[PDB]
Design a protein around this ligand. Sequence first.
Ligand code: FAD
Length: 441
Amino acid sequence: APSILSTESSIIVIGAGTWGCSTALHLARRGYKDVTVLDPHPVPSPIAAGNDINKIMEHSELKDGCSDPRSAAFSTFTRAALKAWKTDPVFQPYFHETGFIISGHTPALIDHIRKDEVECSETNFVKLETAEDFRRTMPPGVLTGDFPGWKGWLHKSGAGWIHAKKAMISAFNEAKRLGVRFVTGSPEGNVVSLVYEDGDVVGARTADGRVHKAHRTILSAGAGSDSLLDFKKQLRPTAWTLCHIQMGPEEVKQYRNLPVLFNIAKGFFMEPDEDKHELKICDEHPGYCNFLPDPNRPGQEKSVPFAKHQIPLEAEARARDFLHDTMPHLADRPLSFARICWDADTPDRAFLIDRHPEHPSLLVAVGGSGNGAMQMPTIGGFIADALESKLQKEVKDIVRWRPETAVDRDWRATQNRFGGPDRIMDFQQVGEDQWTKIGES
Ligand SMILES: Cc1cc2nc3c(=O)[nH]c(=O)nc-3n(C[C@H](O)[C@H](O)[C@H](O)COP(=O)(O)OP(=O)(O)OC[C@H]3O[C@@H](n4cnc5c(N)ncnc54)[C@H](O)[C@@H]3O)c2cc1C
């Protein structure tokens, strides 16, 4: 039914974010001559979850008795990703293999980590038992806290952090040098609808009323994808929170080459960025939704993203609680920046990358599920493979279109996340005066 795919086939990519820029770059490398990317914002988009001074990268090989099909698929994604972060000239300068510490501060959290993470991994970890053990993982003056009740595990190699924002820009620049066209801005790149003819997708319509036609359309608009196609509940747009503290010009010099410090029920931080010397803290929790009436499902809810360069005050407080335990000397410092950041969870938090069974010219590439940024170097390769009907067997069935897994989906499932109230939160229940007020009077 669909037109025969060739390198001369016109291709539209909706969304110039983490996955879209990667897909554009891979398509261009494969020789596709007519690729156009649409985005309501210029790269890097302010609403792209990948637009972040840092994200965590981690790869684990699993012991045999822990390798179900879904986790084997994920290891396949991250194995490929890790290799590319270390080699692809477009991405290599932005990966910092500083290691990764996973930890918890109650017996139940520690046991969950030991049983379900550490003992399933082929990684050899260093066990951190005491506050002193924690502090010694970083240079003097960095970690100063008492880590009360904390125990953890340090993974030295195959993990660290990536400069997601610069790597995205790097992928964008290279896609462009290789001939990809980017229509980025509003209304010209703001897609409001897919375009249908004969029951197939033939392109995209933007908010200026222009119709963009293509032989293939790739939907990779992150959380925003959920309003451009009926995903049959397969996506839950969900938001996490970050804030930055601005480090001083002398103090920042100790904060170099730091392993990621992650408490699965409190949060994490990464080292200050090279440009602004800002230290980022994410407070860990199951996520905020923004539950509004589903326009197509009477009596049902649907989480709808919105952009804000503030975070709820309760999130800031969780971030400072994390700081009190680890770096109390910073716990009262003013925030220089904060924002909410949107991704979308599938029901099993595996990716969703597949051609649409009812519209063969449409490829969806969505469902980052909290783990999509570290995939940036290689995800466009899997996505391109899917477009070319050769997505490899280790992953293709795990990431397929699977609406049957989302029937009567419970939006308030915590989906293996912890922290804060240990429940899914709702922005509709956050008071208008209950946000940070960075940059205001
Ligand atoms: C706080 C937070 C921390 C995270 N930490 C990590 C981590 O440490 N490691 C990790 O691997 N992952 C992490 N993630 C997840 C990761 O950021 C996402 O999975 C990944 O960036 C998603 O990539 P994406 O391309 O699907 O979406 P995005 O990067 O959000 O890009 C989507 C793009 O689509 C565009 N768009 C939107 N709407 C429309 C429209 N109508 N038309 C056209 N275009 C459009 C947007 O402007 C945007 O540029 C984190 C996520 C959050 C929220």
